[PDB]
Amino acid sequence: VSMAKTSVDCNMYICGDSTECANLLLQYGSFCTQLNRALSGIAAEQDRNTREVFAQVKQMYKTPTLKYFGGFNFSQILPDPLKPTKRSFIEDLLFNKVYGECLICAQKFNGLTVLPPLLTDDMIAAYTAALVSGTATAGWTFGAGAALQIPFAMQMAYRFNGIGVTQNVLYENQKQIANQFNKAISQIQESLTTTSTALGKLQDVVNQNAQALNTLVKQLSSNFGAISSVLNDILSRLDPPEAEVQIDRLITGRLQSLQTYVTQQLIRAAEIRASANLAATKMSECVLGQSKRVDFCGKGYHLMSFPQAAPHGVVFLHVTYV
Amino acid sequence: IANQFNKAISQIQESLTTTSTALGKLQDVVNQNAQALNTLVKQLSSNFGAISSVLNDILSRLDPPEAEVQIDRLITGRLQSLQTYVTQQLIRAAEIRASANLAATKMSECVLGQSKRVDFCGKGYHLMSFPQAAPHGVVFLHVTYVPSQERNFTTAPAICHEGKAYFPREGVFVFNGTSWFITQRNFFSPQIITTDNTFVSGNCDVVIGIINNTVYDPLQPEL
Amino acid sequence: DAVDCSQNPLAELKCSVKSFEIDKGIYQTSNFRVVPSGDVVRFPNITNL
Amino acid sequence: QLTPAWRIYSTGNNVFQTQAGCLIGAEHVDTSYECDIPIGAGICASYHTVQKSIVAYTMSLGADSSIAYSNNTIAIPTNFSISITTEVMP
Ligand SMILES: *[C@@H]1O[C@H](CO)[C@@H](O[C@@H]2O[C@H](CO)[C@@H](O[C@@H]3O[C@H](CO[C@H]4O[C@H](CO)[C@@H](O)[C@H](O)[C@@H]4O)[C@@H](O)[C@H](O[C@H]4O[C@H](CO)[C@@H](O)[C@H](O)[C@@H]4O)[C@@H]3O)[C@H](O)[C@H]2NC(C)=O)[C@H](O)[C@H]1NC(C)=O
Ligand SMILES: *[C@@H]1O[C@H](CO)[C@@H](O[C@@H]2O[C@H](CO)[C@@H](O[C@@H]3O[C@H](CO[C@H]4O[C@H](CO)[C@@H](O)[C@H](O)[C@@H]4O)[C@@H](O)[C@H](O[C@H]4O[C@H](CO)[C@@H](O)[C@H](O)[C@@H]4O)[C@@H]3O)[C@H](O)[C@H]2NC(C)=O)[C@H](O)[C@H]1NC(C)=O
Ligand SMILES: *[C@@H]1O[C@H](CO)[C@@H](O[C@@H]2O[C@H](CO)[C@@H](O[C@@H]3O[C@H](CO[C@H]4O[C@H](CO)[C@@H](O)[C@H](O)[C@@H]4O)[C@@H](O)[C@H](O[C@H]4O[C@H](CO)[C@@H](O)[C@H](O)[C@@H]4O)[C@@H]3O)[C@H](O)[C@H]2NC(C)=O)[C@H](O)[C@H]1NC(C)=O
Ligand SMILES: *[C@@H]1O[C@H](CO)[C@@H](O[C@@H]2O[C@H](CO)[C@@H](O[C@@H]3O[C@H](CO[C@H]4O[C@H](CO)[C@@H](O)[C@H](O)[C@@H]4O)[C@@H](O)[C@H](O[C@H]4O[C@H](CO)[C@@H](O)[C@H](O)[C@@H]4O)[C@@H]3O)[C@H](O)[C@H]2NC(C)=O)[C@H](O)[C@H]1NC(C)=O
Ligand SMILES: *[C@@H]1O[C@H](CO)[C@@H](O[C@@H]2O[C@H](CO)[C@@H](O[C@@H]3O[C@H](CO)[C@@H](O)[C@H](O[C@H]4O[C@H](CO)[C@@H](O)[C@H](O)[C@@H]4O)[C@@H]3O)[C@H](O)[C@H]2NC(C)=O)[C@H](O)[C@H]1NC(C)=O
Ligand SMILES: *[C@@H]1O[C@H](CO)[C@@H](O[C@@H]2O[C@H](CO)[C@@H](O[C@@H]3O[C@H](CO)[C@@H](O)[C@H](O)[C@@H]3O)[C@H](O)[C@H]2NC(C)=O)[C@H](O)[C@H]1NC(C)=O
Ligand SMILES: *[C@@H]1O[C@H](CO)[C@@H](O[C@@H]2O[C@H](CO)[C@@H](O[C@@H]3O[C@H](CO)[C@@H](O)[C@H](O)[C@@H]3O)[C@H](O)[C@H]2NC(C)=O)[C@H](O)[C@H]1NC(C)=O
């Protein structure tokens, strides 16, 4: 539900290390400015996408001492305050599977840099934790209004009846159901731990972003028919009058790559928005309520789901009746 | 209900008379259009590496050979500017097109019917909605039911009567000041627990949290 | 009226957005850089006379 | 040694660097509020009393609330209200 908040210095990219060269860029007026504006716009959208998806609850909740409810074991989904890391075990596992910057700061010569998000991973974890913790006790009214305590067993019974199974069945088999639930969680943990395809979608987005940037920078070494891709070696060698032709040519060549880059970024952003919109919808209908539409919250008959924090995305655990 | 409805409408009317953000989304689209148009036209004054940004200032002082070269440079520049514009225009169109599809969906589900899906027509429980005409867009007024102040009651999964386990129908077993009743989860109306508002299945030794209680059966006063 | 676009950061923003009024928020108006000081020029050892 | 620079400009004691960049002229508090004007990395800025000034703060994530769990009792509404929400799309 996001991509890197990239930024490019349009001056330094097209031409640097020269005050003579710079005089030619000025003949294109505010081009440099509007290009910068566009990249900023995209970064702003990335922020919006994240906030809309996660900030679905007005209040934050804290995690209960009890992790055992009606026989159901939720300790792997919830964060455990016992340890320094304010994340669930599942979340840590998910994170472990996936230009200028600052963590100390550093800067490159390519004019590229990436901005930080408003909301850090831990802040997100707080939201996902709050949602699970909240819904665990508030049940059906969690998003509707005030959080009203409903015994876990009663939440389940209601939802079973929702699907069309007399609550009597759940109660008779309560022990069996809790066991299957607990088992499934352990199953998922191992599945994620020993695989290499999980979250492939998130890696894909990151890879695409890197490719776009790598391509943009690499082309700086292109001559475009000029004497050299290096501006500093044009002036030294060629008579300064004629040199303007060589420089303008190089500027034109490079300007073309910026236009291509920014265009592609807008297109990529559109696809992301679509994803974020879906994710937000799923959050509301699969987590904060009980969706009835088939195959929206999983293949089977929807009973429950939980969100987990993820490296530039959202991971859902879908609990279904089969 | 009618009273709150009427006031809610009045409250909105007043809000839309003094605020400044309600239609920010519509103004944003308009502003973007204006910016794009001004940007494209403004570039007509760009030099684009030519001896002059004006065709007349080229032809009027250059022989046709050199003049054509300078014009060609100018043309190439302006062509790229227009191409840039139209590409951006398509991208903008795509986003709006998507919005329109959603808006059509919302009218269909929130206005011409009653939504069951949560958080689509509003945060509360959907009751009603009305479209309103708006410049370059659509404004909806969504009417929802919202639960208010709650009260604490003790509950029970089932009750045991005459050795049999009785389970609730659509409601939940609720305990008030020394009396059990059954009522709907989303409201409070404590009904007498009667044989025809429940069902019996299984004994009392296969239920967790089951309590002892009685079930009314009209047979007795009838007989 | 008139705005001196180099008087202070606020004036710069006013000029940047072509307006004498600003509603609210954070705005990027320009970039910045540090200016180099002295000249470090180095030549080979030079032994050949 | 900076370009650009302004004719009338000075640096006060209100200087503090964060991951998202450093601020000059904005004060820094040990409290939190709703994020008004975002900076980055959990930091936002707003205009508050002290006489008002620009301050930086760690943003609030949401209201502070907690409910006790009970496997014995249930909470249910004993009243309701009706309200109308306004939504706009282009
Ligand atoms: C939800 O379900 C999870 C499990 O799915 C429960 O948490 C588990 O709790 C059990 C305790 O019963 C943990 O047991 C582990 O046993 C390992 C083996 O050593 C013990 O057993 C041998 C058997 O002969 C004895 O000889 C030996 O003396 C020990 O008794 C331990 O090595 C594990 O230790 C872990 O924690 C320590 C903490 O410092 C670490 O240093 C270790 O490296 C290791 O991480 C542990 O004792 C089991 O690991 C738990 N798993 C998890 C994931 O927590 C939850 O409690 C349950 N929740 C609810 C609410 O029911
Ligand atoms: C549903 O049920 C939950 C609990 O399961 C309710 O939450 C509780 O709400 C009650 C409301 O009073 C809280 O009551 C606590 O009582 C303590 C005892 O003192 C009172 O009673 C004695 C009896 O003789 C009187 O003499 C005395 O004057 C008091 O009347 C208080 O000490 C508690 O105060 C707490 O907050 C103050 C705030 O400054 C602190 O200073 C105190 O030290 C203390 O922390 C409090 O009044 C009870 O604590 C709540 N429990 C929980 C877990 O929240 C729900 O409200 C209820 N919902 C509905 C709709 O009924
Ligand atoms: C909902 O979830 C809650 C919390 O998980 C459950 O509440 C707990 O219920 C258990 C059931 O008994 C309570 O158990 C406690 O056991 C203590 C130990 O003594 C008993 O066991 C020994 C074993 O050999 C026997 O010899 C002895 O005779 C007892 O049988 C008791 O001391 C505790 O008593 C408490 O209350 C009395 C009241 O006057 C006090 O005098 C005592 O000092 C003490 O406070 C108690 O019986 C456990 O405490 C409960 N927890 C809480 C927080 O109340 C609910 O049961 C669960 N609901 C359902 C339906 O399962
Ligand atoms: C709703 O109202 C009904 C009717 O009032 C209650 O029914 C009671 O249920 C309890 C269950 O615990 C019955 O208790 C029975 O006691 C018998 C006597 O042994 C006990 O007492 C002697 C006294 O010295 C002790 O020495 C001895 O150790 C015991 O403590 C038991 O024999 C009964 O056991 C039954 O079940 C076992 C299960 O394997 C069988 O093996 C036995 O053969 C036998 O079937 C039982 O424990 C009590 O008698 C019932 N009352 C009546 C009138 O029948 C419900 O409990 C009540 N429900 C609620 C929720 O309150
Ligand atoms: C839990 O629910 C039960 C039932 O749902 C509820 O008990 C009810 O309380 C009301 C109190 O308003 C009782 O209403 C009665 O109505 C008759 C008819 O006019 C009155 O005569 C009754 O007055 C009694 O008390 C007077 C006090 O001086 C006496 O003078 C008079 O003779 C009567 O004794 C009273 O208003 C209603 O009948 C009961 N219902 C039952 C079945 O008892 C209970 O209060 C609820 N508890 C909580 C905490 O909500
Ligand atoms: C921005 O630049 C300043 C100036 O260099 C950095 O401040 C310096 O930070 C280090 C580490 O926090 C300070 O301690 C040093 O640690 C090394 C560790 O081996 C030690 O060898 C040094 O003798 C010293 O102890 C150092 O004193 C400090 N300098 C000053 C003037 O305070 C600052 O960290 C940089 N900011 C970022 C984000 O990198
Ligand atoms: C749900 O709560 C609302 C209020 O939060 C209740 O509506 C209010 O009901 C009273 C009648 O009991 C209405 O009239 C009031 O009467 C008192 C009597 O002295 C008077 O002083 C007040 O000025 C007023 O006239 C009150 O207007 C009404 N509120 C509104 C907005 O109309 C409602 O009844 C509760 N619902 C249930 C089921 O309890």
Side-chain angles (χ1 to χ4, degrees), chain A residues 1-4 6-16 21-22 25-44 46-51 53-57 61-66 68-76 79 81 84 87 89 92-93 95-98 100 102 105-106 109 111 116-117 119-120 123-132 134-136 138-140 142-147 150-153 156-160 162-164 168-171 173-174 177-185 188 192-193 198 200-202 205-207 210 212-215 217 219 224-226 230-232 234 240-241 243 245-246 249-267 269-274 276-284 286-290 293-294 296-298 300-302 306-322, chain B residues 1-13 15-17 22-27 29-43 45 47-52 54-56 58-62 64-65 67-71 73-98 100-108 110-114 117-118 120-127 129-149 151-154 156-161 163 165-168 171-177 180-181 185-195 199 202-204 206 209 211-215 218 221, chain C residues 2 5 7-9 11-15 17 19-20 22 24-34 36 38 40 42 44-45, chain D residues 4-6 8-9 12 15-18 20-22 25-26 28-29 31-33 35-36 38-45 47-48 51 56-71 75 77 79-86 88-90:
Chain A
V1 298
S2 70
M3 62 180 178
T6 63
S7 177
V8 180
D9 187 295
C10 60
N11 186 72
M12 290 305 295
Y13 179 89
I14 293 293
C15 187
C21 177
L25 182 61
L26 295 173
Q27 297 300 310
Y28 298 91
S30 64
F31 174 82
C32 211
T33 299
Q34 66 88 37
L35 178 60
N36 187 267
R37 194 85 70 210
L39 292 170
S40 179
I42 296 297
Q46 300 308 303
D47 183 68
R48 290 185 65 196
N49 288 338
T50 297
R51 285 189 281 108
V53 172
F54 289 101
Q56 291 294 311
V57 63
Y61 293 90
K62 62 178 71 170
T63 301
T65 298
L66 298 176
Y68 193 72
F69 299 91
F72 292 75
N73 185 343
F74 297 98
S75 68
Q76 307 309 93
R87 302 183 186 182
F89 290 179
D92 286 345
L93 179 60
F95 276 94
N96 289 338
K97 297 304 301 187
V98 180
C102 186
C105 300
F109 257 97
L119 282 85
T120 67
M123 292 167 70
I124 297 299
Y127 282 108
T128 57
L131 290 171
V132 172
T135 56
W140 282 93
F142 174 77
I150 301 170
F152 182 76
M156 291 296 286
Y158 191 98
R159 288 189 177 193
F160 265 74
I163 296 303
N168 181 64
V169 174
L170 174 63
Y171 288 113
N173 293 281
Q174 180 178 338
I177 298 302
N179 286 339
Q180 290 178 24
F181 177 84
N182 293 339
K183 181 177 176 69
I185 297 299
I188 291 168
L192 292 170
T193 299
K201 289 179 178 176
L202 299 181
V205 171
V206 172
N207 290 337
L213 295 172
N214 288 337
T215 301
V217 174
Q219 290 292 111
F224 304 94
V230 181
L231 179 291
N232 297 334
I234 295 170
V245 173
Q246 286 285 314
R249 183 181 174 93
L250 184 59
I251 289 169
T252 299
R254 288 179 171 172
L255 287 170
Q256 186 62 37
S257 74
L258 289 169
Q259 184 62 54
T260 300
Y261 175 82
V262 72
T263 300
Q264 291 184 338
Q265 288 292 86
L266 267 60
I267 293 168
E271 186 68 16
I272 293 167
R273 287 181 60 78
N277 290 338
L278 179 60
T281 299
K282 284 172 169 276
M283 188 69 79
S284 293
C286 301
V287 176
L288 278 75
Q290 184 181 25
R293 54 178 291 188
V294 67
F296 187 67
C297 300
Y301 293 90
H302 191 57
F306 307 97
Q308 297 281 267
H312 312 298
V314 180
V315 176
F316 289 99
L317 307 177
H318 296 299
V319 182
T320 62
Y321 172 103
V322 179
Chain B
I1 292 167
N3 288 340
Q4 289 183 26
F5 176 80
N6 292 340
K7 291 196 283 186
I9 292 168
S10 294
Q11 186 65 239
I12 291 169
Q13 185 189 109
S15 180
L16 294 174
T17 303
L23 302 178
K25 289 179 176 178
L26 297 179
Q27 188 63 47
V29 171
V30 172
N31 291 343
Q32 290 171 356
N33 288 335
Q35 290 168 347
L37 293 171
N38 281 269
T39 300
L40 174 62
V41 173
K42 183 161 66 67
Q43 288 185 289
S45 297
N47 194 54
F48 300 110
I51 62 171
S52 178
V54 178
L55 292 170
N56 289 340
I58 296 170
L59 290 168
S60 64
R61 66 195 175 93
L62 285 97
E68 286 173 358
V69 171
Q70 293 301 314
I71 293 167
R73 288 173 67 75
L74 187 149
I75 291 168
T76 298
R78 288 182 174 173
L79 264 284
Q80 291 296 103
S81 293
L82 213 169
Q83 283 286 120
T84 299
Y85 178 91
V86 76
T87 296
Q88 294 297 307
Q89 188 67 7
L90 267 68
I91 293 167
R92 284 190 287 271
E95 188 65 28
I96 293 168
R97 197 181 200 280
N101 289 342
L102 177 61
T105 299
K106 284 179 169 291
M107 190 177 292
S108 295
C110 301
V111 177
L112 299 177
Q114 182 182 25
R117 63 195 294 194
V118 301
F120 186 70
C121 303
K123 291 179 180 178
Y125 296 92
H126 192 63
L127 298 175
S129 65
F130 307 99
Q132 296 281 269
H136 303 291
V138 184
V139 175
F140 291 92
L141 305 177
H142 296 286
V143 184
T144 63
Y145 174 96
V146 179
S148 189
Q149 66 188 357
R151 181 172 169 195
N152 281 353
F153 298 91
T154 299
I159 61 173
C160 183
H161 179 61
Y166 288 80
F167 289 88
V172 62
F173 290 137
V174 63
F175 187 59
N176 98 316
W180 285 94
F181 303 95
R185 182 171 291 176
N186 292 327
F187 188 71
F188 184 60
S189 185
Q191 305 304 302
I192 300 300
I193 299 167
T194 67
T195 184
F199 69 94
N203 64 43
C204 298
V206 296
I211 63 170
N212 272 0
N213 212 325
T214 62
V215 180
Chain C
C5 300
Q7 182 177 329
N8 66 49
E12 182 176 53
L13 175 56
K14 288 180 180 178
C15 290
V17 302
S19 184
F20 281 69
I22 301 164
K24 183 172 182 180
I26 183 165
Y27 301 85
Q28 183 174 0
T29 62
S30 70
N31 60 6
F32 70 95
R33 59 182 61 86
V34 298
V40 178
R42 310 289 285 177
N45 204 246
Chain D
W6 305 271
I8 302 172
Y9 175 85
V15 181
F16 183 70
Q17 181 172 343
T18 62
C22 71
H28 187 197
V29 300
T31 190
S32 61
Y33 306 96
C35 183
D36 196 6
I39 306 301
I43 302 301
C44 301
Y47 195 69
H48 286 282
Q51 181 66 46
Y57 59 98
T58 301
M59 65 185 278
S60 175
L61 299 178
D64 184 354
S65 182
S66 177
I67 59 172
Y69 178 82
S70 177
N71 40 321
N79 201 344
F80 68 93
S81 64
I82 299 168
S83 64
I84 304 175
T85 297
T86 302
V88 61
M89 299 167 282

